Amino acid sequence: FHKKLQDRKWHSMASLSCIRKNSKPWQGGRSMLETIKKGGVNGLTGDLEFGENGGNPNVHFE
Amino acid sequence: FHKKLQDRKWHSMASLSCIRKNSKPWQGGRSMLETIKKGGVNGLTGDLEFGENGGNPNVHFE
Amino acid sequence: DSIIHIGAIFDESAKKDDEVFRTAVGDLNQNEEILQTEKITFSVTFVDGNNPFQAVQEACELMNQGILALVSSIGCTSAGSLQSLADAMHIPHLFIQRSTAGTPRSGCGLTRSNRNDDYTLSVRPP
Amino acid sequence: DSIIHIGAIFDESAKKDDEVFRTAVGDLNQNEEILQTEKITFSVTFVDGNNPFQAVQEACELMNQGILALVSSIGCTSAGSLQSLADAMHIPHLFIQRSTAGTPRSGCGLTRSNRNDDYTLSVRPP
C-alpha cells in the first residue's frame, strides 16, 4: 500500500455487493494484486514473498 | 407436492434473497422437507426413499 | 398460473442429467393421477462444478425466482456450499452426487455443520 | 480519515490469528517509515470454517464496507469458496491455510477454476 501511494497509482476502495443484478468487481483490484504479488518483506517467518504461481516458496525444516 | 396439496398444508413459494440485511428462510421449507423425506417412489433405480439420516439406503451390485 | 416450480443446478458435464430432468417433468405433466390440476414448471442453471461461489450465486438466483425444492447434480467441490446454503434458506435440497470422469465414487466427507437442520437429502445410496 | 482498510475472515479456532493480526496493525501504525501519513484500519469477522456459505456471506459484508485486501486464516473446506469469491470481485486474497487440530497440512486440492484471473496469494509455503 505504501508503494502504491508513493507511486501515484492509488485506487480508492469501493463498496461492493455480492449476488446482485449490477454486482461489479473492484476496479483497483488488478493493480493492487500485482503490487502485492511482487512484494517481499523480512518478518517473523524469515522472508515472505510470492513466486509466479502466487505462492510463497520459502520453507525450512529442522 | 401432490400429498401436500391433498393434506391441505400447502405453503406458497417465496422469492428469497441471499446475503442481504433481511435475508430470511422459506417459511414453507421445514414442512416441505419432512414431506419429501418420508416420500417413496418406484422408478428407474428401483425404489427411491430416504432413511432417518436423509440418505437413500437402497443399492444392489452385480 | 403455476404454483409448482422447482430449481436445478447442474455441472457443465451433466447435459444428460438436464435432458432426463426435462423428460421427467414432461412425463409427470402428462400423468393425470399425480398433481391432477397442476403443472410442474422449472428453472435450470449450469455452473462450473469446481466453482463453489458460482454454484451458491446461481442457486441463490433460482431461490429469488421462487422454488419449492432445489435439485443438484454435481461433484463434492461445490456440494458443501450448496448444502450449507440450503440449510440457511430452508430450501429442500435433492443432491445427486456426480463422480469426476466416471471414477468410482467416494463419500464427499463433507463434515457439514450439524448445529443447523439438514435440508439436504442424498439421492444416491452410500 | 482512513483510506487504508483491510478485511479479515478467521475460523472460530483462530483467536490467536486475530490477536496477532491486531498487534501487527498496531506495530505498523507506530512505524513512521511505512505509510508515513496513513493509519491502517480493519474489519474482522469470525466464521464457522466448515460453513462455506457463511464464509462467502461474511466476506461479502466486508467487501460492502470497502476493503483493499482480504486476509483469511481458515481450513480447506471454505478456502475454495473464498478464492472463487475473490476472483469474481477482484479483491486480493491473502490465504493462510490452517490445519485441523494441529494435524499435518496436506494441499487443499481445491482445483480452483483457472479460466479467471487468480486473486489468491497463498501465504504459507507448499
Curated annotation (Swiss-Prot), chains C, D:
Kindly list the residues the record flags as site (Essential for dimerization): 53
In which tissues does this protein get expressed? Answer: Expressed at high levels in the cerebellar Purkinje cell layer, almost absent in the forebrain.
**Where is this chain's protein located in or outside the cell?**
Postsynaptic cell membrane
Which domain of life, per UniProt?
A: Eukaryota
Q: Which cysteines are joined by disulfide bonds?
A: 76-108
Quoted from the entry, the domain comment is: The PDZ-binding motif mediates interaction with GOPC.
UniProt function note: Member of the ionotropic glutamate receptor family, which plays a crucial role in synaptic organization and signal transduction in the central nervous system. Although it shares structural features with ionotropic glutamate receptors, does not bind glutamate as a primary ligand. Promotes synaptogenesis and mediates the D-Serine-dependent long term depression signals and AMPA receptor endocytosis of cerebellar parallel fiber-Purkinje cell (PF-PC) synapses through the NRX1B-CBLN1-GRID2 triad complex.
* Assembly and oligomerization: Tetramer; dimer of dimers. Interacts with AP4M1. Interacts with EML2. Interacts with MAGI2 (via PDZ domains). Interacts with BECN1, GOPC, GRID2IP, SHANK1 and SHANK2. Interacts with CBLN2, but not with CBLN4. Interacts with CBLN1 (via C1q domain); the interaction is CBLN1-NRX1 complex formation-dependent; CBLN1-binding is calcium-independent; CBLN1 hexamers anchor GRID2 N-terminal domain dimers to monomeric NRXN1 isoform beta; promotes synaptogenesis and mediates the D-Serine-dependent long term depression signals and AMPA receptor endocytosis.
Regarding protein family, the annotation reads: Belongs to the glutamate-gated ion channel (TC 1.A.10.1) family. GRID2 subfamily.
Protein name, as recorded: Glutamate receptor ionotropic, delta-2
State the organism of origin. Answer: Rattus norvegicus
> Top-down, what is the taxonomic lineage of the species of origin?
Eukaryota, Metazoa, Chordata, Craniata, Vertebrata
Which gene codes for it?
Grid2
Q: Which residues of the full protein are shown?
A: 24 to 149 of 1007
